[PDB]
Structures are given as C-alpha cells and as structure tokens.
C-alpha cells in the first residue's frame with residue numbers, strides 16, 4: 796500500500812509515534828517519505844547482504860528475520876515480511892525499539908541526511924490530525 800502524506804501521519808499518530816522519544820510526527824513522516832516513498836512494500840538490499848523492509852526500511856541484520864542474513868539478530872522478533880503489510884503496526888512497534896536503541900532517529904540514513912535539521916513540521920501541514 797502506498798500511503799498518502801496525511802493518511803500516514805494520522806496512522807502513525809494513532810500508533811503513538813507523535814513525540815515518541817521526543818521526535819515530533821513530522822520527523823516520522825519525513826523519514827517514511829525518503830526511506831520508502833510511503834510504500835509499505837519497499838525492499839532494498841545492502842552491500843553487506845542484509846535487506847531493508849517496509850515503510851521505515853527496517854534492516855534484517857539486527858531487527859527482523861528474513862532467513863537469508865546469516866549471523867543476524869532478530870531484535871524485533873518478527874519475520875521481515877511482516878513489515879511489508881498494509882497495516883503499519885509491526886513497523887511502528889519495531890521502529891519504537893530502534894529509536895530507543897541509543898542513536899535515536901540517526902539510525903535512519905535518509906532521516907539524518909534529508910530530514911534532520913529541516914522544517915519537518917511542513918510534512919504534516921494541512922493535515923487533519
């Protein structure tokens with residue numbers, strides 16, 4: 796499913812992401828936009844053999860199991876495929892653990908390079924939340 800900007804903001808808000816660990820909703824929407832273009836079915840393989848899954852591009856080396864990333868952990872205890880569902884619940888709960896890991900949202904490369912330090916509030920402007 797390819798979410799609409801406001802549609803996703805509302806979904807994330809309902810799942811308790813707004814202000815989660817101090818990160819305003821705009822940050823999460825901005826991260827999703829540049830990580831997957833709001834597409835829950837996005838997948839991208841990295842040089843190390845791991846693969847990123849879903850709307851927030853959760854990595855298989857540490858957060859989920861895809862059965863093909865040897866020596867990897869499954870910190871979120873979920874099959875990576877679960878992160879490609881139209882229901883973002885799985886992705887959200889896993890993202891909550893990732894952002895509490897220590898480096899915050901810096902874990903998401905696109906957020907660090909394209910959202911961090913910008914007017915992220917613009918990502919939810921005009922939306923009915």
Ligand SMILES: OC[C@H]1O[C@@](CO)(O[C@H]2O[C@H](CO)[C@@H](O)[C@H](O)[C@H]2O)[C@@H](O)[C@@H]1O
Nearest residue numbers: 847851852853854857898901902903904
């Ligand atoms: O804990 C994940 C850790 O790995 C890095 C790369 O070193 O990012 C990977 O995981 C992210 C979250 O799942 C992906 O968005 C990213 O594309 C992937 O390389 C670090 O940025 C992050 O701290």
